[PDB]
Amino acid sequence: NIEPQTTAKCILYTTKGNIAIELWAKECPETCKRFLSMLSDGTFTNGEFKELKPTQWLMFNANSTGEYRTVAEEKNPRIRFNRDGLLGWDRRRNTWFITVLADSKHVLNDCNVFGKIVGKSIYIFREILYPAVLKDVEITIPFFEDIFGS
Amino acid sequence: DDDEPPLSYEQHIENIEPLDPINLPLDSQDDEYVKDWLYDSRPLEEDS
Amino acid sequence: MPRIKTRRSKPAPDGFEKIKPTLTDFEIQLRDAQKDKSSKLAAKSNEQLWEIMQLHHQRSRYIYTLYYKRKAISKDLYDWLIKEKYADKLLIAKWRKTGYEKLCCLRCIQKNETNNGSTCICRVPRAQLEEEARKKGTQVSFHQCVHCGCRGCASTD
Amino acid sequence: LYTPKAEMPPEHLRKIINTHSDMASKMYNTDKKAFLGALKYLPHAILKLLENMPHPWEQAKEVKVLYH
Amino acid sequence: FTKSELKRRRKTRKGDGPWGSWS
Amino acid sequence: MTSWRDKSAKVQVKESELPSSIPAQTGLTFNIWYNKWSQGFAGNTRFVSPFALQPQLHSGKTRGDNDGQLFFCLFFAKGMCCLGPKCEYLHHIPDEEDIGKLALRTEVLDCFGREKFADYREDMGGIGSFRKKNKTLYVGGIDGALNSKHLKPAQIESRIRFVFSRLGDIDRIRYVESKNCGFVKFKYQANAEFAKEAMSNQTLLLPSDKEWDDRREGTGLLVKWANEDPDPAAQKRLQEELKLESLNMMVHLINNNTNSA
Amino acid sequence: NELHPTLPTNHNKTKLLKSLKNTKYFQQTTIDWVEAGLQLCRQGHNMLN
Ligand SMILES: [Zn+2]
Ligand SMILES: [Zn+2]
Ligand SMILES: [Zn+2]
Ligand SMILES: [Zn+2]
Numbered sequence: 001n002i003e004p005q006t007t008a009k010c011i012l013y014t015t016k017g018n019i020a021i022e023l024w025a026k027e028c029p030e031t032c033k034r035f036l037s038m039l040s041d042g043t044f045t046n047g048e049f050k051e052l053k054p055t056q057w058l059m060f061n062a063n064s065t066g067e068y069r070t071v072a073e074e075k076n077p078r079i080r081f082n083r084d085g086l087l088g089w090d091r092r093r094n095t096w097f098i099t100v101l102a103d104s105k106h107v108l109n110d111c112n113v114f115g116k117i118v119g120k121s122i123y124i125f126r127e128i129l130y131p132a133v134l135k136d137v138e139i140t141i142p143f144f145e146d147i148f149g150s
Numbered sequence: 151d152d153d154e155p156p157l158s159y160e161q162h163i164e165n166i167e168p169l170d171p172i173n174l175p176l177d178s179q180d181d182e183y184v185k186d187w188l189y190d191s192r193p194l195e196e197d198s
Numbered sequence: 199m200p201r202i203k204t205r206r207s208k209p210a211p212d213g214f215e216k217i218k219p220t221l222t223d224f225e226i227q228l229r230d231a232q233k234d235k236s237s238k239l240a241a242k243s244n245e246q247l248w249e250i251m252q253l254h255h256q257r258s259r260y261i262y263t264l265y266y267k268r269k270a271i272s273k274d275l276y277d278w279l280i281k282e283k284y285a286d287k288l289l290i291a292k293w294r295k296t297g298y299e300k301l302c303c304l305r306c307i308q309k310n311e312t313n314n315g316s317t318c319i320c321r322v323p324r325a326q327l328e329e330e331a332r333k334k335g336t337q338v339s340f341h342q343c344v345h346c347g348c349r350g351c352a353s354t355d
Numbered sequence: 356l357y358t359p360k361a362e363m364p365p366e367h368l369r370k371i372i373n374t375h376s377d378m379a380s381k382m383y384n385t386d387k388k389a390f391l392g393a394l395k396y397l398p399h400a401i402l403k404l405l406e407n408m409p410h411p412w413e414q415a416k417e418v419k420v421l422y423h
Numbered sequence: 424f425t426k427s428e429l430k431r432r433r434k435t436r437k438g439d440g441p442w443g444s445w446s
Numbered sequence: 447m448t449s450w451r452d453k454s455a456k457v458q459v460k461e462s463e464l465p466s467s468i469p470a471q472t473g474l475t476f477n478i479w480y481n482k483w484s485q486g487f488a489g490n491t492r493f494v495s496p497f498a499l500q501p502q503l504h505s506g507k508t509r510g511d512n513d514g515q516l517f518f519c520l521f522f523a524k525g526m527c528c529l530g531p532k533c534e535y536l537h538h539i540p541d542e543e544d545i546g547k548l549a550l551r552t553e554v555l556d557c558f559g560r561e562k563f564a565d566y567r568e569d570m571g572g573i574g575s576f577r578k579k580n581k582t583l584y585v586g587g588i589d590g591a592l593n594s595k596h597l598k599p600a601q602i603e604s605r606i607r608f609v610f611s612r613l614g615d616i617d618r619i620r621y622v623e624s625k626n627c628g629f630v631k632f633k634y635q636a637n638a639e640f641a642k643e644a645m646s647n648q649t650l651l652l653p654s655d656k657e658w659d660d661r662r663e664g665t666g667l668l669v670k671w672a673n674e675d676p677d678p679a680a681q682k683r684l685q686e687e688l689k690l691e692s693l694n695m696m697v698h699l700i701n702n703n704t705n706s707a
Numbered sequence: 708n709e710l711h712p713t714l715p716t717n718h719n720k721t722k723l724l725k726s727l728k729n730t731k732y733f734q735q736t737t738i739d740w741v742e743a744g745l746q747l748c749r750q751g752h753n754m755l756n
Contacts, residue, residue, distance in 0.1 A: 076161075077158070156745055156748040171413055189205075200737060204414045232370055233373065237461070239528070251367070254366070256440075288362055305363070309356050324432070324445065325429070338445075346441075348442060349436070355433055375753070381481075391754065400747055409740055417740070418737065420736055420737070421735055422733065423732055
């Protein structure tokens with residue numbers, strides 16, 4: 001595991017169970033600002049698991065942050081798609097991307113590798129193998145102290 | 151890892167700030183003659 | 199003190215903030231240039247290297263005009279920009295000379311490397327290569343210098 | 356005559372090494388024979404790398420290099 | 424060749440500098 | 447002229463559309479010295495070309511024209527060149543003006559600039575010979591080119607005649623049904639060399655020929671060199687044209703003695 | 708080491724790296740040490756393959 005040290009944690013509260021999530025905020029400053037904003041602004045809440053792509057990814061919380069614009073592309077080749085449970089980010093308007101079990105490298109360099117799942121709750125994610133919705137959000141560790149909420 | 155290609159400099163390494171090296175804190179009084187230039191690479195290179 | 203900031207690096211002098219937006223814009227054009235675009239053709243591959251020689255040349259004309267032409271920077275900032283490897287010292291040293299004011303690089307006046315002990319073809323003035331062309335009736339079998347992709351760096355030109 | 360060596364940009368060496376990662380084109384056939392000619396001189400390059408190693412009081416060292 | 428003829432021709436090449444293309 | 451002298455040559459294939467330098471998948475592990483696949487059996491690795499030459503559409507002036515280039519772009523002959531007007535070789539069909547400039551050099555080189563060899567080859571493949579001036583191109587693989595549909599041998603002859611007609615002065619064509627073989631003789635060596643590269647590994651079938659969607663699965667029409675003609679009418683005709691071209695240079699070999707005196 | 712000295716010979720001033728920088732084929736630059744060593748790992752792995 002050559003990946004960097006994670007910096008921001010955001011616990012998701014779904015109907016299936018708790019999804020603990022950690023984020024790389026130094027190595028990827030922009031996609032954290034599109035994520036941590038829309039958690040606290042409530043625009044992710046009550047979002048259904050939308051489209052399962054078998055062996056590739058599953059997609060939820062597609063609504064859009066600000067001005068319906070894009071995200072400045074940033075890649076670190078220490079942070080790659082080799083596992084399941086890796087959060088991604090589609091090039092489209094403000095849409096998540098959660099990698100399956102086949103973990104192919106064909107989805108790389110086309111999406112933004114963004115965060116992980118803390119290993120206690122990868123078993124909750126494997127229950128999906130009536131989609132789940134997002135009830136509550138608690139941002140336990142914000143890295144962006146200044147920008148977020150100001 | 152044995153399967154990992156030797157990682158590239160300008161993508162992985164060049165943007166990180168370096169950590170501190172091993173320096174002993176020089177006494178402000180005893181080490182007055184040396185403590186400006188002691189830990190330099192080629193310490194007194196620019197003196198005539 | 200060449201490229202990355204360490205504890206042995208001195209803090210930057212006064213006028214660095216006003217020139218820093220242009221130097222950051224040269225710096226991100228080199229990062230696009232460093233990466234490998236996977237190119238099959240041998241003629242396309244050295245064409246990528248010519249972009250690096252040009253981007254290097256232009257950032258050194260930038261610091262050269264700020265100090266030797268416009269005098270918009272102090273000498274303490276110029277000594278810092280040399281030591282922190284922003285500007286090529288040995289290339290600026292030829293630009294000060296007479297006949298070398300617009301020289302593309304140092305590899306093109308280096309006589310020992312050539313087959314014939316000569317300069318590069320890009321150092322010959324365009325008036326003169328057009329002249330023996332008139333002897334033959336064919337325009338120019340010269341477009342870009344092999345070491346730079348220079349179309350002619352002569353002073354009169 | 357004798358002018359000394361041109362000091363080149365450090366980006367020029369990077370680009371050449373990033374280009375030679377995948378040598379599947381026929382344009383690389385002469386350079387592949389140069390990699391086998393370089394193998395005789397590899398223990399000399401190892402000695403120059405290891406004698407110029409950073410000591411524990413310095414963070415980073417810049418060194419002059421010579422590259423094919 | 425004269426200097427005023429030389430100054431008018433260096434404006435004809437496009438790219439503003441030694442990478443400025445003739446024709 | 448209408449096609450070539452007024453235009454500039456266009457780009458047939460973009461550089462991002464150029465095919466991968468790695469071949470498809472023949473064995474288990476790829477050898478990075480020889481650029482081949484190893485450890486297994488190969489599976490008749492020939493394939494048809496996804497591109498082709500469009501004589502009137504793609505010809506135009508190039509940077510080889512302004513510099514005085516003798517030789518022709520081989521990727522233009524294949525329909526693959528990505529430089530277009532930047533390329534240092536000629537993008538048009540060889541003609542009597544340029545072939546007159548390929549006179550001293552064409553004895554040992556071909557029209558693309560490649561050296562010729564003494565022996566031919568065991569299967570009469572790529573480049574020619576500097577011992578024999580062979581102006582006739584063998585055509586084979588016609589079953590693989592037509593994608594295994596049937597046609598009459600009279601209609602096969604015409605479909606060979608048309609696609610070869612553009613590539614230069616065609617001397618004669620004689621399709622054989624007994625051996626599915628086309629013997630296409632040109633006026634010039636330099637147009638046989640151009641046509642051999644241009645129609646190698648192509649498809650014969652036309653866009654209206656009902657299999658234009660599926661034609662990439664083939665093997666293409668093989669284009670090798672032609673052996674000596676065994677029927678005795680052409681051998682006497684070979685003896686005739688040997689004698690009359692001899693006397694033409696019996697004239698000039700006593701003119702440069704007359705210049706000598 | 709003190710008992711068996713091996714003396715240098717005065718003729719040998721040829722020095723591999725100086726005769727190699729005479730030719731066209733080698734150039735100079737200045738880089739980080741960690742960059743130079745990571746290059747030689749990549750370069751020596753190509754030679755053996
Ligand atoms: Zn140059
Ligand atoms: Zn030059
Ligand atoms: Zn030049
Ligand atoms: Zn071409």
